Every structure is written in C-alpha cells, then in structure tokens.
Amino acid sequence: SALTQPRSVSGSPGQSVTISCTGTNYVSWYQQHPGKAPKLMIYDVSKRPSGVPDRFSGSKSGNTASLTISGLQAEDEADYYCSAFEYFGGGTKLTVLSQPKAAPSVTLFPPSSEELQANKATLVCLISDFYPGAVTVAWKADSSPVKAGVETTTPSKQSNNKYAASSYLSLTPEQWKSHKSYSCQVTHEGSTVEKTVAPTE
C-alpha cells in the first residue's frame, strides 16, 4: 500500500544495477522515459512481457522486491516505478553514468533590501553542477526544520549535462529578522551541502 523505492540509482554501461521496492507476489515494474507513458517491464515479481529485453529481471526477498538490469545500456536511463495492485512506489531515477558523479554547488541568497522594503522576503537557494540529477532540499530556521513556504524545482540539465535546481523559501520580513539564521540543505547521493545566511541590518 505504501511502496518505498530509492530516489536515485546509478551504474555505468555494461554494469548491473538493482532497484528495490519495500512494502508491508504481485509487485510489478514500469519504466518511463520523458514524454512517454510508463512501459511495463516486469510483472508478478519475475514475469517479462513479450519484447522486454532479457537483461531485465525481477526477484523478491521477504517483503522487498527487486528489479535487476544487467548490461546497462544508455537507453535504460529512465524513471522506474514499482507497483502492487493499484499502488505505486514513488519512483527511482536510474542514471546510466556518462561522466563522473559531481556534488552540487550551492549558493544561498538572503532577501534583498528592496524586497524587504516591499514587505516580502524570499530566500533563494541555487543548486548547480550535480550529477546524477537527483537531489532533495530541506530548509532550517536556526536549527529547526521549515516546510511551510518552500518551493523546489525539479532538476534540469545544464550545457555540460550536469543538473541544476533551485529552492525558494518565502517568509515575512518579521520571520526573517526574528531568527539568527536560515539554512538550505541539499542532499545528493547520500551526502549533504548546507549553506546558511543571516540577517545583516
């Protein structure tokens, strides 16, 4: 009912990768390329629909189903969703690595004087040069998590085929001035880069 899969998996061409799906015998797997409908790759744990390459296989441990792709090819880079009856996992971006992994560059800007004078406040967290193209962004006010007022974009490709994203935190000027600092925390491939800004008159 609440199927969980990793946000990001990656491997190099020719390698094998595995995507897990954890729940609470009918787990299936879809592949989705940009602008296209999902394509069924594996159903009922291990069955392959006609025409799906033999490199795609499925298995099931206890309560974790697994899609394995052997001999990774560039065309396998796509989103993958597990499913069980009407329920879907949240999706895994599979990257077929074509350059070294790269951590995000993060720049955080505080509200401008002009915006504060207009009675608004926006923190701007700009995230660039990361690969694979999957990040999560969290914000903190002082040391406590902030979720209200946050908007984050999906990653997009830059000229060098790395990825960029941005996240915006909307606050009142009073909220901005009442904390010692705010922080934007970007998680990429399990590690985090966090930038902090503070009110400065």
Binding site: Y26, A37, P38, L40, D44, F88, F109, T122, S166, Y168
Partner: protein, 225 residues
C-alpha cells in the same frame, strides 16, 4: 496493434471540469477493464480508478471520490474520465491504461497505456515580474569569485529570459528554470560568477525579458554596504 489513443492537452481554470477521452483499438474494448492513472509534473504515478466497460461499474480512489466520473461508449470503444471542481494541483498528465496481454489474474499491472493527456489548471493571468537584485557579498565568494544575481519574482505565464550586460557577459551565467508558486505565478533566478576584484569597477545589469507582458527590466546589481 493493441493501443489506446487519448484526446489532446487541455487548459482549465480552477472550479471547472475536464473530460478526457481514451479510444481503444486492436483489441476488444469490452473484454477488459479501463483504468486511469495520473502524474503531476515531476511527481509519481497515482491510480485514480477503473471502469468495467461491460457493466459500467466503477471504483475510484478515495482522493477523487465526488469529483471523478468514468464512463464509456462501447459503440466507439471509448472510455472517458471527467474530473470536476478542478484544483490547480490537478495539473497532471492523465493516462488511461489497462491489462490485455499478460499472464495474470489480477487486472494489475497495465501493459497497454494511452499516450497521456496533459491538463493544466491555473487561475493566473498575465503579470510582469518584479525584479530584485541578489547582491554579492563575502558569503557568495570562493575562488576570488563572487556570485551575484537577479530574482525575477511573480510573473505569468512563462517564459522569462535573462541576459547580463546586454549579452556582453556570458561566461559564468546560469539562469535557472522557474518554480511555480502556489499563487500560480512563477519565479526564477539568474546568477553570474565574476571576479570579486571587478566589483565596484564593473557594472552588472541583468536584462530580464517577459514577452508575454511586453515587459523588459534592466536591473543594476551592486554590492551591499
């Protein structure tokens, strides 16, 4: 060829309704259920419900109860999904899908999918941006390099483009894709990395173009005090 063909993309205002069609061919439409699945932009798949084209019976996910009506016209092998009282967060690709050729008893998963129908729900009207400077500081500095930028706030519709110094400044420029706010307006930012020694000597102006509102803004970005 077993296939499902959907109607084209739609644009609606909140509170309205949308009706998407899905025409089956290459298999007997009445032999199989028809399901609908949607996917909000950048998000995952969510099942909405099914219709039995023989009985007309339906079953809907709890999220869509009271707002979704699935129907079919067997004479033209077509299923319909009508979603009413539309919300901005109903903006999504809507797929019809079903199970036709598989060796399974469950009716899930789905081997046959329509191409999807994008439905955009928005209450926003044309509005030019407010442009704020993102001033450089010793915080936005690293390799003797300073980052400065422009925040282009609260515009509609897309797109906005940004250049720096009327196009004379291209190295180190990065204009980011826009975020869509809950207000229905977009914001984006553009940043440029420059030599920190050049601050105070070189003028930096971001040139924002929002053709949908016939607006251009040239915003000077200078260091803080």
């Amino acid at each position: 060829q077993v296939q499902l063909v959907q109607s084209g993309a739609e644009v609606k205002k909140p509170g309205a309704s949308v009706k998407v069609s899905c025409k089956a061919s290459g298999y007997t439409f009445t032999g199989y259920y028809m399901h609908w699945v949607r996917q909000a932009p950048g998000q995952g798949l969510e099942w909405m419900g099914w219709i039995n084209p023989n009985s007309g019976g339906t079953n809907y996910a709890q999220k869509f109860q009271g707002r979704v009506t699935m129907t079919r016209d067997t004479s033209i092998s077509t299923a319909y999904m009508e979603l009413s009282r539309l919300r901005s967060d109903d903006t999504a690709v809507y797929y019809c899908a079903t199970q036709v050729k598989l060796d399974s008893s469950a009716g899930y998963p789905f081997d046959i999918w329509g191409q999807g129908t994008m439905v955009t729900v928005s209450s926003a009207s044309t509005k030019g941006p407010s442009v704020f400077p993102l001033a450089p500081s010793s915080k936005s500095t690293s390799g003797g390099t300073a980052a400065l930028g422009c925040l282009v706030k609260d515009y509609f519709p897309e797109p906005v483009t940004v250049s720096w110094n009327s196009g004379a400044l291209t190295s180190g420029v990065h204009t980011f894709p826009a975020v869509l706010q809950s207000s229905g307006l977009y914001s984006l930012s553009s940043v440029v990395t420059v030599p920190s020694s050049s601050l105070g000597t070189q003028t930096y102006i971001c040139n924002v173009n929002h053709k949908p509102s016939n607006t251009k803004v040239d915003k000077k970005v200078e260091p803080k005090s």
